[PDB]
Every structure is written in structure tokens, then in C-alpha cells.
Amino acid sequence: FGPQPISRLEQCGINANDVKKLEEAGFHTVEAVAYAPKKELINIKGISEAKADKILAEAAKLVPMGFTTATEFHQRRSEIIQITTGSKELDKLLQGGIETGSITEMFGEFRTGKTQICHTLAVTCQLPIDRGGGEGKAMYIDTEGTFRPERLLAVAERYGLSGSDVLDNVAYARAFNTDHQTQLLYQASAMMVESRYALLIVDSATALYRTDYSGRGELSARQMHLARFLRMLLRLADEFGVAVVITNQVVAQVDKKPIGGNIIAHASTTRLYLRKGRGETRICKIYDSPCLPEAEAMFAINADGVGDAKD
Amino acid sequence: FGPQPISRLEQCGINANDVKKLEEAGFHTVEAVAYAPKKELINIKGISEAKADKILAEAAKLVPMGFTTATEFHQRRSEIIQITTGSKELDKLLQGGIETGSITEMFGEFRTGKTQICHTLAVTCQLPIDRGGGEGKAMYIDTEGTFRPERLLAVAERYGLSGSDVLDNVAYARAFNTDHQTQLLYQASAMMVESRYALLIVDSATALYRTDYSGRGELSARQMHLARFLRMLLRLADEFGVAVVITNQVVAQVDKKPIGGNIIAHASTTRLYLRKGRGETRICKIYDSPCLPEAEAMFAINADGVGDAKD
Amino acid sequence: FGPQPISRLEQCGINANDVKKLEEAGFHTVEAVAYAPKKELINIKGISEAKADKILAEAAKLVPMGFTTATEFHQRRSEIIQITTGSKELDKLLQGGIETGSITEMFGEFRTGKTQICHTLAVTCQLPIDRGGGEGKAMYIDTEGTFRPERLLAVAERYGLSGSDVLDNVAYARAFNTDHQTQLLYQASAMMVESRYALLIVDSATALYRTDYSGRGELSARQMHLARFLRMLLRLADEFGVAVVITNQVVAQVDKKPIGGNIIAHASTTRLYLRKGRGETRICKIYDSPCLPEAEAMFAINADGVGDAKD
Numbered sequence: 001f002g003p004q005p006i007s008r009l010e011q012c013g014i015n016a017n018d019v020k021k022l023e024e025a026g027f028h029t030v031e032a033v034a035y036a037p038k039k040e041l042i043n044i045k046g047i048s049e050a051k052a053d054k055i056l057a058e059a060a061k062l063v064p065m066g067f068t069t070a071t072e073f074h075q076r077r078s079e080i081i082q083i084t085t086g087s088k089e090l091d092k093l094l095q096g097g098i099e100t101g102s103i104t105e106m107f108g109e110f111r112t113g114k115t116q117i118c119h120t121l122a123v124t125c126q127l128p129i130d131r132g133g134g135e136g137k138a139m140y141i142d143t144e145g146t147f148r149p150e151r152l153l154a155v156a157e158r159y160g161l162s163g164s165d166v167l168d169n170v171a172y173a174r175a176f177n178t179d180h181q182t183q184l185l186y187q188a189s190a191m192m193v194e195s196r197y198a199l200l201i202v203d204s205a206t207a208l209y210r211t212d213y214s215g216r217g218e219l220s221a222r223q224m225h226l227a228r229f230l231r232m233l234l235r236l237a238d239e240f241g242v243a244v245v246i247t248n249q250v251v252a253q254v255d256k257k258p259i260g261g262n263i264i265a266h267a268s269t270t271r272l273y274l275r276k277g278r279g280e281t282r283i284c285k286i287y288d289s290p291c292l293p294e295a296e297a298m299f300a301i302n303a304d305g306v307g308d309a310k311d
Numbered sequence: 312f313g314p315q316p317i318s319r320l321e322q323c324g325i326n327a328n329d330v331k332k333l334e335e336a337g338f339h340t341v342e343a344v345a346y347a348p349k350k351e352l353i354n355i356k357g358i359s360e361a362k363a364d365k366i367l368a369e370a371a372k373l374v375p376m377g378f379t380t381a382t383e384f385h386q387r388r389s390e391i392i393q394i395t396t397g398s399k400e401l402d403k404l405l406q407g408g409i410e411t412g413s414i415t416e417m418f419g420e421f422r423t424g425k426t427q428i429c430h431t432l433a434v435t436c437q438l439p440i441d442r443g444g445g446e447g448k449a450m451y452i453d454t455e456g457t458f459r460p461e462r463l464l465a466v467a468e469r470y471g472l473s474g475s476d477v478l479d480n481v482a483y484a485r486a487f488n489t490d491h492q493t494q495l496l497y498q499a500s501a502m503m504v505e506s507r508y509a510l511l512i513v514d515s516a517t518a519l520y521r522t523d524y525s526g527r528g529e530l531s532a533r534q535m536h537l538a539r540f541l542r543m544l545l546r547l548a549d550e551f552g553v554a555v556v557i558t559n560q561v562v563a564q565v566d567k568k569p570i571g572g573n574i575i576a577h578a579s580t581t582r583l584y585l586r587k588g589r590g591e592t593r594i595c596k597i598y599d600s601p602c603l604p605e606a607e608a609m610f611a612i613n614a615d616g617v618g619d620a621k622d
Numbered sequence: 623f624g625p626q627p628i629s630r631l632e633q634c635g636i637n638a639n640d641v642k643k644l645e646e647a648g649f650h651t652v653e654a655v656a657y658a659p660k661k662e663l664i665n666i667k668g669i670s671e672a673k674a675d676k677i678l679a680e681a682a683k684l685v686p687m688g689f690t691t692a693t694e695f696h697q698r699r700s701e702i703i704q705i706t707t708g709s710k711e712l713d714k715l716l717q718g719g720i721e722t723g724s725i726t727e728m729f730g731e732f733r734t735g736k737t738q739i740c741h742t743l744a745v746t747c748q749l750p751i752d753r754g755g756g757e758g759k760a761m762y763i764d765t766e767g768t769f770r771p772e773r774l775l776a777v778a779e780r781y782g783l784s785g786s787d788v789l790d791n792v793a794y795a796r797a798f799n800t801d802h803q804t805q806l807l808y809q810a811s812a813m814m815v816e817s818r819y820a821l822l823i824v825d826s827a828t829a830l831y832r833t834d835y836s837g838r839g840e841l842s843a844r845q846m847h848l849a850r851f852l853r854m855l856l857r858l859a860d861e862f863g864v865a866v867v868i869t870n871q872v873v874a875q876v877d878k879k880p881i882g883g884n885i886i887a888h889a890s891t892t893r894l895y896l897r898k899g900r901g902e903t904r905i906c907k908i909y910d911s912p913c914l915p916e917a918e919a920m921f922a923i924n925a926d927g928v929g930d931a932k933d
């Protein structure tokens with residue numbers, strides 16, 4: 001029920017031809033269709049004045065904000081679900097868990113468990129609201145080929161759900177390059193129209209972007225392309241309130257650091273760092289998150305997935 | 312009491328039809344209606360000569376400057392309120408605080424606390440004049456979705472005010488694109504007609520402008536659009552004397568820098584830089600401000616908001 | 623004593639009605655009334671032949687040049703006062719200072735100190751001729767709202783003058799748009815009739831002109847309007863010999879530059895560039911000035927105003 005469909009903005013100014021171009025353009029709702037600047041709609045082989053009428057009409061009949069106090073907004077935030085991670089110590093750290101209708105991503109070294117957390121979340125989101133993760137199908141865009149359904153099965157056994165049913169409600173595709181990476185998101189937006197989603201794990205979203213192209217010159221272009229990809233996610237984030245989790249790679253300071261420069265920085269509504277401890281033990285620390293201060297946690301990696309310190 | 316309303320410029324040349332177009336055009340006062348060039352009024356389906364009469368009539372009965380010495384002006388500046396930041400060290404830096412009827416904005420890296428300062432100011436402005444921040448409702452245009460009423464509650468507890476009352480006097484809306492960004496300002500101007508305002512925090516005003524469009528070609532257009540947005544703010548700044556605070560993003564030099572190019576530069580009646588120090592500690596330094604020289608400060612981020620170096 | 627009044631051109635052809643229109647037209651002298659071509663006077667609801675008689679009469683009794691050698695003119699240039707800047711290094715650069723009965727303007731980046739220099743000059747012009755700046759009241763048209771009387775007080779303390787008296791002899795108004803910008807100049811011309819003036823700082827004269835209107839189309843109009851504004855200044859420059867200083871904004875080359883195209887180019891009787899150096903230090907360099915070739919200078923910004931390199 002979360003969004004209002006495109007076929008709803010059919011007041012008296014949605015003809016066949018009019019709405020024959022908006023869907024194909026990549027608009028499968030009224031929200032993301034309003035959210036768009038005159039700039040957007042005009043660049044899609046429409047008529048200047050015809051397209052302008054389309055905007056104003058929909059906008060009046062979509063609640064396009066206009067200083068709606070703060071008390072009312074405060075209540076809005078109380079209704080937002082927070083997904084459980086499976087570790088009590090990790091849950092405590094997030095004062096509940098991973099926020100929806102936001103951007104939340106972790107980076108660390110290889111072996112640290114960023115890929116791990118994603119698999120665990122893919123299952124934990126397939127539960128009753130009362131048991132943390134609220135009902136809603138999970139989508140996984142992997143870029144590393146590090147998807148392992150077997151890992152999901154072990155998590156399903158811990159939480160005592162039918163593996164086969166859980167795997168029906170997690171959806172997968174592999175993005176293989178930058179242009180594909182962006183392109184895949186348009187398919188994503190269509191997917192969440194038909195059925196209610198809760199979760200995105202985009203495995204290594206930004207990690208592809210380093211091998212992708214350039215290096216040090218015509219990187220301007222990379223930052224532009226990433227920023228464009230990232231704004232789309234955020235569009236997708238407020239439109240439906242699906243929870244965006246991105247995986248990140250790191251680079252040494254050489255004079256230990258989340259890659260992609262700053263563009264990813266300003267995007268992040270919540271940041272996390274992983275590093276390896278002794279044996280199976282691992283450390284998560286918050287980096288940048290508006291809500292709660294910087295804090296550390298012990299947790300471990302069990303055969304059941306991401307759990308508390310077995311010791 | 313700060314402005315004179317549109318229905319005041321009703322001497323003998325404000326008919327129904329005459330004043331039926333000025334409001335809808337985006338004029339909710341006599342100040343901003345005078346401040347306008349013949350250019351402005353003429354571009355709004357009015358009559359050349361009819362509109363010209365409207366200008367001259369209002370202008371004579373609005374004190375449209377004309378070399379009113381400097382001693383008189385000096386006294387005017389003594390009457391301007393300076394908002395407190397909550398950190399004594401930070402307050403000292405601004406020889407009182409954030410000037411009203413101006414443009415004051417900070418930029419830094421992610422995690423630095425630009426968003427932080429905004430939330431803190433949103434509360435500090437809801438106080439008696441004697442306790443720094445003068446009485447007058449706060450308006451928050453966010454673009455990042457980094458608004459957290461919870462953060463405001465912690466600040467309210469420190470200063471011992473009713474959270475619920477404070478949240479009634481802070482107003483919120485999210486701008487989602489360039490055209491929306493500008494559009495939202497027209498609603499803003501109407502808002503401050505009905506009730507007395509003190510504060511604007513526009514979170515990431517300029518930060519939206521990078522993902523917004525183009526890059527390196529047809530950027531001319533971006534600068535034009537930003538400059539237009541920025542002049543409107545300034546219009547709003549002298550008209551009512553509401554205090555404008557803008558958040559900014561940064562870009563690496565690649566051969567560390569406030570984005571949007573120079574257009575934002577000339578706008579700024581006061582500039583600030585934030586960077587991260589060791590632990591919870593942070594550094595603010597002044598950049599460009601006509602009044603006081605370049606100086607540095609230690610401050611920290613407490614659970615109460617932006618405070619002094621706990622140490 | 624600098625000009626001859628309008629009521630002086632009352633030989634035998636200045637009636638009530640005749641001189642009832644020239645003042646209101648914007649003529650408060652014989653100089654600017656003579657400099658005007660037939661075109662001017664005829665466009666102000668006068669009689670063709672009546673207005674023609676008005677021209678010829680005044681012209682005969684105003685010394686309207688007529689190829690007056692070179693040697694005599696050379697002596698005229700020796701009598702022109704040159705205002706001090708307060709920095710010995712900066713003074714040396716101008717072989718004395720800012721020429722009067724001319725157009726002298728600086729541009730640079732934000733933070734560079736163009737606004738700074740203006741404030742400093744506003745005080746330095748309130749002195750005995752022997753101490754640089756010659757006696758005569760200062761007028762400041764600001765467009766940015768970057769006027770700070772406090773800055774003038776610090777300068778007054780250095781030069782040991784009564785702040786209150788100095789502020790009585792600096793006059794201020796804010797121009798808020800193009801039409802206002804031009805309009806304000808007519809009030810200016812009247813101001814200098816009653817009392818002897820020395821100085822104009824027009825803060826950001828041209829800087830308003832970019833946000834003002836258009837962009838890339840119907841810019842021909844901007845050029846026309848600026849050129850008209852600029853010619854008026856020059857009229858004001860030869861008429862009274864009041865010293866015109868204009869502030870300018872800059873634009874990136876995008877393939878660092880004084881804004882407003884070429885029209886400002888030909889106007890400039892002397893040009894200056896500012897850029898930031900290390901710490902409080904700044905560099906001024908001459909651009910285009912007929913008199914002395916291109917040279918560079920170190921100077922600094924002290925709490926006393928614009929001074930020499932403290933080091």
C-alpha cells in the first residue's frame with residue numbers, strides 16, 4: 001500500500017500517449033514522478049507545455065510537502081521499522097537496527113564480513129514485524145559473485161523458517177559493469193511496484209566502480225556517474241521506503257578508508273566499519289550516523305550466520 | 312511587526328485586479344514588492360503603464376533608502392540579534408553568534424557536524440532574547456533526509472524547554488530537486504507573513520545542486536539557477552530579517568573545497584569550515600566574513616548536542 | 623566650488639518653466655547639462671526650438687573645450703589629488719593612489735578583500751590633503767549588504783579621528799536591483815550639489831548585474847543597461863571630479879575573469895586584481911591602467927584595516 005501507482009494520477013490529464021512515455025522513461029508511480037524536476041520530464045521526447053501541465057496536475061494531488069511542522073513528522077519516524085541483525089550486541093549498537101527509507105552501508109578489509117551481514121539480513125527481513133524484520137520481499141544486487149544461497153539456508157534454520165519459501169522471497173541479479181549497475185536499478189523500481197519489498201542489499205555497489213574505469217584522470221566522470229546512481233537509490237528510498245544497504249571496498253591512506261571519495265559520503269544517512277578481531281571474533285563500530293553516537297561492539301561469525309560472541 | 316503587508320500599499324492604487332496578480336506572482340509584502348526591478352512586475356501578465364504606476368506609488372511610501380548617512384545605519388546594526396550556538400568557544404568565535412538578515416553557511420567533510428549544528432540551532436532559537444536566541448519560529452528545509460526530531464529533543468532537555476512546544480515552533484519540508492528547491496522558497500515567504508520567524512536552516516541547499524544536473528557542460532545553466540535561488544534568499548533576508556543558514560558539500564582539488572563554484576561565494580555574508588579532530592572533538596575555523604578575522608576553535612559533540620570540549 | 627550650478631546658466635534664457643523641467647530631468651549643474659547631446663534634452667517633454675536655444679546659450683558660457691593644446695592640459699593633471707590606501711606597498715603601486723575624476727575598480731575571488739579596501743578608503747578620504755586623502759564627504763552604494771560601520775571604526779582609531787564625525791561624513795544606501803541601481807545615481811548627483819564629495823565606493827556595482835536578469839539570451843539588453851549606468855558614472859566623474867571606485871565579481875574561464883563582459887572594459891580608466899596568499903597575506907596586481915605598467919604587491923589585512931605585510 002506504501003506508494004500510489006501511475007495509473008492513479010489519472011485525473012483528467014492522463015491520456016494513452018501522455019502515460020505511454022512516462023512508464024518507458026522509468027516512472028512506475030506518482031511519487032518519483034512528482035519528485036522529478038521540469039528538467040527530467042522535458043528530456044524524454046515530450047512537449048514543453050504538455051509535460052508542464054502533467055507536472056502541476058499530479059503535484060497538487062500528491063502532498064508535495066510545504067512546511068508540515070515537526071510534531072507531525074516526529075510521529076512519522078515512530079512508525080519506521082528497524083530490521084534486526086541477529087546479534088543482540090550489534091542490534092544494541094543501532095538502537096534497534098537498520099533504518100528503512102535511508103542509506104546504510106558498511107566497509108572494511110576483505111574477510112571482515114560485509115558480505116556476511118548481507119546474507120544474514122536477507123533472511124532476517126523475512127519475518128513477522130514482532131520478530132524484528134517486517135514482512136516484505138528482499139532484493140540482492142550482487143557485483144562480486146559472492147552470493148551463496150547455502151548461507152541463507154543456515155540462517156533460515158536458526159530462525160526456523162522454510163528455506164524454499166525464504167529463497168522465493170529473496171530476488172537476485174548480478175550487475176557486471178557501471179552502465180549495467182545503473183540500468184539494473186530501473187528494473188528494480190518496476191519489481192517493487194507489483195509486490196511489497198523491504199530490503200536491498202547491493203553487494204559492493206561502489207566496489208565495482210574502481211575496476212570500472214579511469215583512475216586519476218577523467219575520474220570526474222566516475223564521480224558524476226556514481227552520484228547519479230546514488231541519487232536514484234535515494235529516490236527509491238523515499239518513494240517506497242525500501243531499506244537500502246550497500247557494501248563498500250577500502251583503500252590505504254599511503255602517507256583503512258571507504259572508497260569512491262566523498263560522493264558516497266554525503267549520500268550515507270548511516271555508516272559502519274568492520275575489522276577483524278582474534279579468532280572468529282569481529283568488531284563493528286559506527287562511523288557517521290545522525291541518530292546515535294560513535295560506539296563499538298564485539299560479535300562473531302557462527303555457522304548459523306552473524307551471532308553474538310560465542311566465547 | 313518586522314514587515315509591512317501588501318494590503319498596506321493600498322493607498323489609492325490597489326484594486327482587486329491590481330493586487331489579484333501580485334500575491335499569486337509571489338509578493339506577500341511591500342518590501343520585496345519595492346525591491347523588484349520594473350523587469351520583475353512586467354513579466355507577470357500586467358499592463359506596462361498600470362504596473363509602472365503600482366511601483367512608484369509604493370516606493371514613495373516605503374523608505375527606498377537614498378543616502379541615509381552612516382551613524383543612523385550604525386545604530387541599526389546594534390539592534391540585530393546574534394543567535395547562540397550552545398558552545399561558548401564557538402560563540403566567542405562569532406563575537407556572539409549567527410547574524411540575522413544575512414547568509415551564513417558551513418561546509419566540511421561528511422561526519423564533521425554541519426547537519427549537527429543545524430539541529431542544535433533549531434532549538435537554541437526558541438528562547439528568550441536574554442538567553443541568546445530571540446523569540447521567533449524556526450523553519451528547516453532539508454534535502455538529505457537527515458532531519459532527526461530526536462536530536463532536537465536532547466537539545467530541548469539541556470535548555471529545559473517543553474519538547475512538544477519546541478517541535479510546534481520548528482517547521483519542516485523536504486526539497487527533492489532544483490525546481491522544487493526554488494519552488495519551496497515561495498511557500499516559505501508566505502509562511503513568514505502570518506507568524507514571526509527567526510531561523511532558516513536549509514540543509515545542504517547547494518548540496519543537491521551537484522547530483523541535480525549536467526556536470527561540466529551546460530553548467531552555465533546550473534550557476535544561473537543557483538544564483539537565482541540565492542538572490543531570492545537574500546531578498547528574504549533583508550525583507551524580514553529572518554536568519555539564513557545553508558549547509559554545504561565539498562570537492563577535492565585533485566592536483567577540501569566549498570561546492571557550487573563561486574556563485575555561492577559572493578552570496579556569503581559569513582563563511583565557516585568544519586573538520587574532524589581526535590575522538591569526539593572537532594575544529595571550526597572562519598573562512599570569509601566581513602566582520603571578524605579568521606580564527607580557530609575546539610568544540611565537541613555531546614549527547615546534549617553541540618557543546619564545549621568535555622575533555 | 624568644483625562645479626557651476628544650474629541657477630548660474632541663468633543669463634537671459636532661464637525662465638521658471640524652462641528650468642522647471644531640467645532639474646526633474648536629472649540636471650543639477652551646467653557641466654552635465656552641456657555634455658548632453660541634443661538627443662538628451664529633446665527626449666524630456668520640451669519644445670524642439672526652445673530646448674535648442676537652452677543648449678547653445680549654456681555652451682558659450684561653459685568653456686566647451688575646442689582643441690586646447692596639450693601643455694595646458696598637462697598642468698591640469700598635476701593638480702589632481704591621489705587618495706592613499708593605507709598600505710605603503712599598495713600606494714607605491716599606484717604611484718600615489720586612486721585617481722579622482724576617473725573609474726577605478728577591483729575584482730577577485732571571494733575572501734580576497736575587495737569589500738575590505740572599500741571600507742578602508744571610506745575613512746582614508748576623511749583627512750587633510752597633506753595626509754593623503756583630501757577633504758570631502760564619502761558616499762557608499764552597497765549591493766551585497768557587506769557594509770560594516772565597525773570596520774570603519776577600527777580604521778578611524780589607526781588614523782586617530784573621531785569615529786562619530788567620520789560616520790557623519792560617510793553616506794550609505796543599498797541598491798537592490800538594476801532599475802534601482804541606475805535610479806540611485808540620480809539621487810547621488812543631487813547629494814554632491816549641496817556638499818563637496820571626494821569618494822564613491824560602489825560595492826559590487828557590476829556584481830548585482832549577473833543575478834539581475836537573463837543569462838545568454840536577451841543579454842544584449844544587460845549590456846545596454848550596464849553601459850548606460852556606466853556612462854552616467856563617467857558623466858559624474860568629469861562633472862564634479864568625485865573619485866569612482868567600483869567592486870567586481872569573477873567568472874571561471876571553463877576551457878579568474880572580471881564579470882559583465884567587455885562594456886566594463888572600455889569604461890575602466892584603471893584596473894586591479896586581488897588574489898589570496900598564505901595566511902593573512904594578499905597580492906594586488908595592476909591589470910589595465912594607461913599611466914604605469916603592470917606591477918605586483920604584497921600587503922596584509924590587519925585588525926586596523928588594509929596595512930603592510932606585518933610578517
Ligand SMILES: Nc1ncnc2c1ncn2[C@@H]1O[C@H](COP(=O)(O)OP(=O)(O)NP(=O)(O)O)[C@@H](O)[C@H]1O
Nearest residue numbers: 109110111112113114115116144146301302303304
Ligand atoms: N558457514 C560459515 N560459518 C562461519 N564462518 C564462515 C562461513 N563461511 C565463511 N566464513 C568465514 O567468515 C568470514 C566472513 O567474511 P566475508 O563475508 O567472507 O568477507 P567479505 O565481506 O566477503 N569480503 P569480499 O570478498 O571483498 O566481499 C570469513 O573470514 C570466512 O572464513
Ligand SMILES: Nc1ncnc2c1ncn2[C@@H]1O[C@H](COP(=O)(O)OP(=O)(O)NP(=O)(O)O)[C@@H](O)[C@H]1O
Nearest residue numbers: 266290291292293294422423424425426427613614
Ligand atoms: N546523539 C549523538 N550524540 C553525540 N554524537 C552523535 C550523536 N548522533 C550522531 N553523533 C556523531 O556526531 C557526528 C556529527 O556529524 P554529522 O552531523 O553526522 O555530519 P553531517 O553534517 O551529517 N554530513 P552529511 O551526512 O553529508 O549531512 C557524527 O560523526 C556522528 O557519529
Ligand SMILES: Nc1ncnc2c1ncn2[C@@H]1O[C@H](COP(=O)(O)OP(=O)(O)NP(=O)(O)O)[C@@H](O)[C@H]1O
Nearest residue numbers: 577601602603604605733734735736737738924925
Ligand atoms: N576585522 C578584521 N581584521 C582582520 N581580518 C579580517 C577582519 N574582518 C574580516 N577579515 C578577513 O579579511 C578578509 C577580507 O576579505 P573580504 O573583504 O571579506 O572579501 P570580499 O571582497 O568581501 N568578497 P564578497 O563577499 O564577494 O564581497 C577575509 O578573508 C576575512 O576573514
